[PDB]
Amino acid sequence: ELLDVIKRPVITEKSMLAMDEKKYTFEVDTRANKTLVKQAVESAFDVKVANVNILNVRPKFKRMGKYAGYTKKRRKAIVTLTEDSKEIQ
Amino acid sequence: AKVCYFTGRKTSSGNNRSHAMNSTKRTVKPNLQKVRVLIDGKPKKVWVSARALK
Amino acid sequence: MFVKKGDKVKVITGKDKNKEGVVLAAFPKQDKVIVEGVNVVKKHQKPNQAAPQGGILEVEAPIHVSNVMVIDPSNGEATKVAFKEVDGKKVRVSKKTGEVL
Amino acid sequence: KVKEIRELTTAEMLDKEKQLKEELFNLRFQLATGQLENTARIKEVRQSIARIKTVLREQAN
RNA sequence: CUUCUAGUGAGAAAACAACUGCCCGUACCGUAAACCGACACAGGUAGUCGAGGAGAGUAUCCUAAGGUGAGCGAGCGAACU
RNA sequence: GUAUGAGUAGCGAAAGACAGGUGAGAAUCCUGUCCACCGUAUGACUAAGGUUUCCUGGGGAAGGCUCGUCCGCCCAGGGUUAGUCGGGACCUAAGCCGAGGCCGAUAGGCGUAGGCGAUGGACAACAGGUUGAUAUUCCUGUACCAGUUGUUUGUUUGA
RNA sequence: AGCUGUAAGUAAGCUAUGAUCCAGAGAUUUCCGAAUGGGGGAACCCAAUAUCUUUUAUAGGAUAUUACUUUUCAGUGAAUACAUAGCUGAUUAGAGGUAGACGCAGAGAACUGAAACAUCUUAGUACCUGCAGGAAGAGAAAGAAAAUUCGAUUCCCUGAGUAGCGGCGAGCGAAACGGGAAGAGCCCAAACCAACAAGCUUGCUUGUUGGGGUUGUAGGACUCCGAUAUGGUAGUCUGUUAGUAUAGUUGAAGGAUUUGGAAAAUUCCGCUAAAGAGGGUGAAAGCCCCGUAGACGAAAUGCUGACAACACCUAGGAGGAUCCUGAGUACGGCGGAACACGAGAAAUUCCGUCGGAAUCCGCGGGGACCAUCCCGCAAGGCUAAAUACUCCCUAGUGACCGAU
């Protein structure tokens, strides 16, 4: 559906270093492809993509007030470019 | 040997009774034989009671 | 709630008996009301975003709504309140000679 | 505010749906990178999309 | 995988260039304080690698690469176990 | 819920010592130097199993058989990247399920075609560098496997 | 007139152009699960066929369809020729859960009591399996009785701890009469008569549709004349209103004084009631707040009546020549069970097995059996109410509990 696929960017210290090699981190939808994410990114910014990489993240046990339960699941995709750039801030 | 096609005779239970009136359980059965009949053209081998063939 | 947020009101019971004041806020579903200058309380705050010098401060506390009575704006005596059929914006039509509140 | 969505056609309907979905994408990217003073606009857009979709269902029987 | 035909059945062999290639796991412990034993428990846990001197050797004693000083202490130096 | 036994038994195999740091406070945490222990293992890698225990910055109420400034404990943030490795889009063993079928008070039991099912068969990538935490997965160099596009004669069958 | 649940805390906002909130009707509704395209260690994996999309292209995305059985219809079809097994397609229904309740069936214990234990008891109870319905089951006399009878079924009182049954032990235990709640009756088969098809016996034998016909005071067919009207329904998603459930509206009458932090308490002097039930308020309130008695209200959807239409059903008198009235059935021997009734002198009702009637000059019952008299007419179908139960929703109640 190409506009519900990408959720938001990841902004951590390991992801700032990737922006200097032309790599961008997004939390994407669960039930999404390597190929589907690639299509969505090429559609929403007009770039050219080499190589999406993709991971799954486990939920974490948390415990606030004598009530415990897990956070969400997560999907993280890292998008490499040929030559162009996206400006997120 | 489970029922008959035209009546319904099936198996049931009964008692033995042995000369001092002791009772145990027991099976009673009908007298079913396999026969070829013409039920709507094509013959079939069905279980039929001997009382309905009589 | 039979009493509204902008409204002059007199006090029936509780140590501010006979005081008047304009209603400051209405809390339906707990049936309380804040009246101007009526239930003064003294707190003790430590510095936070508002008043980075947290002294001993004084504001009103909500009293129960049945400790209160409406005053006819035009005449000035406390009245029980009734509802009557004007051109169909039913307003509180005061008892004590049928005037609109 | 359906009183205006009922002043349009089923082509401009799908057009404004595209526009609002794109607005949601951009809002969602603002909220993550430290912007978006007015956070009450995310709910408003969700509800305008909901309205277009109900009105389009109603009219096509 | 390799052959042989039967077979619906234009005309695919091979040069260069540039492109495409999905889903699940992947941290860390693992002869152990993270597994099975209610315990930070003298027990148990499949497989590969596993160096030197003297030696038949993966035995024995001392060592290399690597690891460790073990989660109550200080004194005294009786009977008894 | 609280006593007595009673401040008694025990504190779960083993080598430490001193100097200097930190700190409210140190036999027990950090840094050094010498000493001592294992070494077909008490070293390195991995399949189960566990499931965040992993890394960085703080904390000291409880847990830790003493202590604690410390921790596999507590609070906040962060970490797992594959055409080629292991599994699926491949194959079948034991066993299991089984359209029709055959049996049987009911419920149901068995079994043919056809399937599921690795502990076995088949199957294309290597060496080095890099983080606080991943690497045959990221990067560098040089490859390989299956496809797609373009530029380089009778489907009879001798194409 | 405020509001964004618990839920504080802050940040952004919404609302007098009517928010929030409340009742009726709609829309959306991921994935698993009977789970049903194939698979599977539930919430996962892998497809086929069409239409549509991304890309120069392959790879990628979306939407529909695809289990099994039955029951109706075409096509194809054969060991074996004619065609039946089979196969493909279209159509029709099921399938699972529960309210730990109530009902009807199938199969069916033991400890226990007998002061031991076998018949017997516990008990056709517990458990398991099938089928249901809002209730089920039974139901329109092959009946109950005994002169003088009464008329379908169910439930309650009584008969009565009686008559009975019983190692005649432990123990089990009726029914009809009499008094009540509720009340209701109907439809087929057969003879016969027509239309059609086959056997064209061109005899009228086989059948399909429609008519006729439903009983014991015997009834019907059939022939004879009358009438061709009149009494009803347990029927419909048809109209006309009347009510009703699901939000709401309005609703009387008090001030001062003393003691307290605070009065509803005390003391004075008033008022109100078709409302002195109950809850709240800084302590104990008819008169402060919410209510109460009384009066009023529904756009929408669902229920229950009534009256209209539409659909169905229903006639007398006579005759007694002939035809009909449920067959492997009633019944009998053998073996078991159910009846309060344990084989007993054992009628009545069922199941298995073998034998096996009659036809109105008939057939069954009145507790072995016979004769006489009396009451009924089996071997076909359906049916409201009066009775049982409460997972759940509304409104209440208690000489019921009050944190072991």
Query: Which nucleotide is closest to A51, CA to C1'?
Result: F81
Token pair 């009575």 in the structure block, residue: C69
Task: Please state the three-class secondary structure of B24-36 as a single string.
Answer: EEEEECCCEEEEE
Number of domains in chain D: 1
Structure tokens at C90: 């039913």
Which domain does C90 fall in, by range?
1-101
- For A26, list phi and psi in degrees, rounded to 5: -130, 140
Cβ neighbours for B47, distance < 8 A, ≥ 6 positions apart: B1, B2, B3, B4, B5, B32, B33, B34
Contact A75, A54 (CB under 8 A): yes
DSSP class of residue D39? T
Angle between helices D10-32 and D41-59 (to 10 degrees): 160
Number of domains in chain B: 1
Distance, CA of D9 to CA of D60 (rounded, Å): 12
Number of domains in chain C: 1
Please name the residues between 16 and 45 in chain D that touch chain A, using a CB distance below 8 Å: 21-22, 24-25, 28-29, 31-34
Which domain does D19 fall in, by range?
1-61
**DSSP-derived secondary structure for A32-76:** --HHHHHHHHHHHH---EEEEEEEEE---EEESSS-EEE---EEE
Q: Which residue, D3, D4, D14, D6, is CA-closest to D49?
A: D14
To one decimal place, what's the resolution in Å?
A: 2.9
Contacts of D29 in chain A (CB under 8 A): 8-9, 88
Amino acid identity of residue D30, one-letter, is: Q
Structure tokens at C57: 């401060």
CB-based contact, A19 to chain D, within 8 Å = no
Chain C contact partners (≥3 CB pairs within 8 A): none
Residue A66's Cβ-side half-sphere holds a number of Cα atoms within 13 Å equal to: 0
CB-based contact, A8 to chain D, within 8 Å = yes
Distance, CA of D27 to CA of D36 (rounded, Å): 7
Contact B9, B49 (CB under 8 A): yes
